[PDB]
Design a protein around this ligand. Structure first.
Ligand SMILES: N[C@H](Cc1ccccc1)C(=O)N1CCC[C@H]1C(=O)NCc1cnccc1Cl
Ligand SMILES: *[C@@H]1O[C@H](CO)[C@@H](O)[C@H](O)[C@H]1NC(C)=O
Ligand code: NA
Ligand code: NA
Lengths: 11, 28, 251
């Protein structure tokens, strides 16, 4: 339901 | 900090939001 | 938020969204109180009855948001957590007494038109404004009704309620570390926090210095926007000594 956020923030 | 609670798009430009007056009116 | 309205752009620039990394989902509201500190409800991070016990690496905070679900490129800023601090006497066992937590960000967030901290109350501002009938403002991306979800941040203004009325509305034991707010059945108007609004701010605009102060944290209720029920909020000033101790020691 949420737009994916930039991968940099999940590293 | 010293600038807390002053919103860039409202207080800082002396613009009021649509319902803040409702709060002020209740502060009797 | 039930029976509220869409926030204006930049209306609540201290609004923070607590976001779960995996699965990606909204966890709670929160508020920005400085460039490195975020305030929320303890139950947003720790609530054993529901098997909730988040650690720093489970979470992100998203600051400067308006849309609930969109990634707001060039506007919102996403920050990782350095450390979580929960009130040592937070009562998750009984009644959510002292429902407060701080989160220290790994890096300071840059302030902007959409990102700016709220003030915490001193004793006098609290004494002057925390009075029955005085209205505060609650914001969040939580559910629009008890039993759906908003496109953008919601806002509702609600009056503080007399303590005896708060007490008489519920079987749960209330304490001096809580206050309640909402309209009475006879007053006509409506509105409440709901699921998903947890941890967000109850704010008041001081008529003395025209600054916004966070008086409460969305803590608990029984249902959402029920007649004869009221929302309960952590009393931020009553717990400010703890807030200050944490910030002074770990800042
Ligand atoms: N419904 C419970 C009532 C309660 C209160 C104290 C102790 C145990 C249970 C509640 O609000 N809870 C249980 C734990 C967290 C909190 C919550 O959901 N808060 C968010 C909320 C949900 N629905 C309506 C209003 C609110 Cl503030
Ligand atoms: C919650 O998590 C922490 C750390 O993983 C743990 O030490 C604690 O015992 C857990 N339960 C609590 C605080 O009730
Ligand atoms: Na009671
Ligand atoms: Na109600």
């Amino acid at each position: 339901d949420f737009e994916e956020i930039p991968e940099e923030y999940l590293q | 900090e010293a600038d807390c609670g002053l919103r860039p798009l409202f207080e800082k430009k002396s613009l009021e939001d649509k319902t803040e007056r409702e709060l002020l009116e209740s502060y009797i | 938020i039930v029976e509220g309205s869409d926030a204006e752009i930049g209306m609540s620039p201290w609004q923070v969204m607590l976001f779960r990394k995996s699965p990606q989902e909204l966890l709670c509201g929160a508020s920005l109180i400085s460039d490195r500190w975020v305030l929320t409800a303890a139950h947003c991070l720790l609530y054993p009855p529901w098997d909730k016990n988040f650690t720093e690496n489970d979470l992100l905070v998203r600051i400067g948001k308006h849309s609930r679900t969109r990634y707001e490129r060039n506007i919102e800023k996403i920050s990782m957590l350095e450390k979580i601090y929960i009130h040592p006497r937070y009562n998750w066992r009984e009644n959510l007494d002292r429902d407060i937590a701080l989160m220290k960000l790994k890096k300071p967030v840059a302030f902007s038109d959409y990102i700016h901290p709220v003030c915490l109350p001193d004793r006098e501002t609290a004494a002057s404004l925390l009075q029955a009938g005085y209205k505060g403002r609650v914001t969040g991306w939580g559910n629009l009704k008890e039993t759906g979800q908003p496109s953008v941040l919601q806002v509702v203004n609600l009056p503080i309620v007399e303590r005896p009325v708060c007490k008489d509305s519920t079987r749960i034991r209330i304490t001096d570390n809580m206050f309640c707010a909402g309209y009475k059945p006879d007053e006509g108007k409506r509105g409440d926090a709901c699921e998903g609004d947890s941890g967000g701010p109850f704010v008041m605009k001081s008529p003395f210095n025209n600054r916004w102060y966070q008086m409460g944290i969305v803590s608990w209720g029984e249902g959402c926007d029920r007649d004869g029920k009221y929302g309960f909020y952590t009393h931020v000033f009553r717990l400010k000594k703890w807030i200050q101790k944490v910030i002074d020691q770990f800042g």
